[PDB]
């Protein structure tokens, strides 16, 4: 995935071949591990969706398919197939 930013915050452009794998990227505050569970994750195209993966410390996830454990991150991926 391409690591960029959105208003000072880290942003992940996730491609199709990354579905199902732990997303890791270094940050001043250590190594960040985001987890992408999006069922509709497809091919990067015009039909993108973009949203935030909250920071989750010792809390079970609820009503979400993306989250990081060290620093909140934005994520973007296409839905095409």
């Amino acid at each position: 995935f391409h690591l960029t930013t959105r208003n000072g915050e880290p942003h992940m452009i996730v491609s199709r071949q990354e579905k199902g794998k732990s997303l890791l990227f270094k940050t001043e505050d250590g190594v960040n591990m985001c987890t992408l569970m999006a069922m509709d994750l497809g091919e990067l195209c015009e039909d993108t969706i973009t949203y935030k993966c909250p920071l989750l410390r010792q809390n079970e996830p609820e009503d979400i398919d993306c989250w990081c454990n060290s620093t909140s991150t934005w994520v973007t991926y296409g839905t095409c197939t």
């Binding site: 935030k52 909250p54 996830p61 993306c66």
Partner: protein, 390 residues
């Protein structure tokens, strides 16, 4: 094949003549009909209104009927921290919605409770329709003025003139005869209505219905084609989730529209212009017209009736003839009684003349009712043709 035939072949044909000299003569022009005018020592003319179209009428509103969505983005805040926002919520090309969604420890919030969420998607119109307003003025009527000569073809068009209810009196030149002057009035066609255009196919629809259509639109005087109004009409926002929300766009509405317009008067069109079947009232003056060919010789020769004399739908006949001994000349036509004593009937073709040797010169004439002799030509073989008009 001959000049003036079009009007002879029409069922709706009016014969008008001025009861004065130098005076104005009134005529009524309709689509599919023609008017033949006559006057002493003046050529007979044919008038036809062939086209009535609105040119570049004001565009009222553009409606989007099919769109796509891209870059859908979601933002949301925890209970207690106010309404979230996205800067694209200020970009007129996006459709956005504000909602509330449950939040809590499972999705990054300290408190359980409703939180503010917002979602935007770029809206891209892929197919639109536009309704226009036709002003009575700026309507353009096309009228053809054809000299009733009978000359042949199979290069001799009648003068075509285009006018507007705002244009001044027209002075039309007829090669060889001078000019004819006329003025017209769109004398009673309505326009609180609107003309809907769905990809080169148009309809006439009532206003307030067009204006009520639940579809994204843009004020007529636009060119951006981006800042659509009421995009939510083609967009649906699914129930939100803590951090994301789906947005889907309805499918094309071209179909819902088509099978919705059935019933309303369909309007023909071409080259982007709308066409109508107009109605005109005109007045014309012939003081500047004169017979083409005066001061020639009186054919002194022979004619062979090219083919079977024809009867028109208007109590008249069309005799084809072709010279023979002479110059491109005047023809001696004359319809008399069986005794050849007095003149009867009259010519619709006036000052009939021959331009070439072996050039069928059609001639339309009006024989009196009953019996009459059609005398074509002069003293070698003055052509006595018997005729009975029933």
């Amino acid at each position: 094949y001959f000049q003036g035939m079009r009007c002879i072949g029409m069922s709706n044909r009016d014969f008008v003549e001025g009861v004065s000299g130098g005076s104005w003569v009134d005529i009524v022009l309709e689509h599919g009909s023609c008017v033949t005018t006559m006057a002493k020592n003046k050529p007979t003319l044919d008038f036809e209104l062939i086209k009535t179209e609105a040119k570049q009428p004001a565009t009222l509103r553009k409606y989007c009927i099919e769109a796509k969505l891209t870059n859908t983005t979601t933002e949301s805040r925890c209970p207690t921290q106010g309404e979230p926002s996205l800067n694209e919520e200020q970009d007129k090309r996006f459709v956005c919605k504000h909602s509330m969604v449950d939040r809590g420890w499972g999705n990054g919030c300290g408190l359980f409770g409703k939180g503010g969420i917002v979602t935007c998607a770029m809206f891209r119109c892929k197919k639109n329709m536009e309704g226009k307003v036709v002003q009575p003025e700026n309507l353009e009527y096309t009228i053809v003025i054809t000299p009733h000569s009978g000359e042949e073809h199979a290069g001799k068009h009648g003068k075509e003139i285009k006018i507007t209810p705002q244009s001044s009196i027209t002075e039309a030149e007829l090669t060889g005869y001078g000019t004819v002057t006329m003025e017209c009035s769109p004398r009673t066609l309505d326009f609180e209505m609107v003309l809907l255009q769905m990809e080169n196919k148009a309809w006439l629809v009532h206003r307030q219905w067009f204006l009520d259509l639940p579809l994204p639109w843009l004020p007529g005087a636009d060119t951006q084609g981006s800042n659509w109004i009421q995009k939510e009409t083609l967009v649906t926002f699914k129930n939100p989730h803590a951090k994301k929300q789906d947005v889907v766009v309805l499918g094309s509405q071209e179909g819902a529209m088509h099978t919705a317009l059935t019933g309303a008067t369909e309007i023909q069109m071409s080259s982007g212009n709308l066409l109508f079947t107009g109605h005109l009232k005109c007045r014309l003056r012939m003081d500047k017209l004169q017979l083409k060919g005066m001061s020639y010789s009186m054919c002194t020769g022979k004619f062979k009736v090219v083919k079977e004399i024809a009867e028109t739908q208007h109590g008249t006949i069309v005799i084809r003839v072709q010279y023979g001994d002479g110059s491109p000349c005047k023809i001696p036509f004359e319809i008399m009684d069986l005794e050849k004593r007095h003149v009867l009937g009259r010519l619709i073709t006036v000052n009939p003349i021959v331009t070439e040797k072996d050039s069928p010169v059609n001639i339309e004439a009006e024989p009196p009712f009953g019996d009459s002799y059609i005398i074509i030509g002069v003293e070698p073989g003055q052509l006595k043709l018997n005729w009975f008009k029933k």
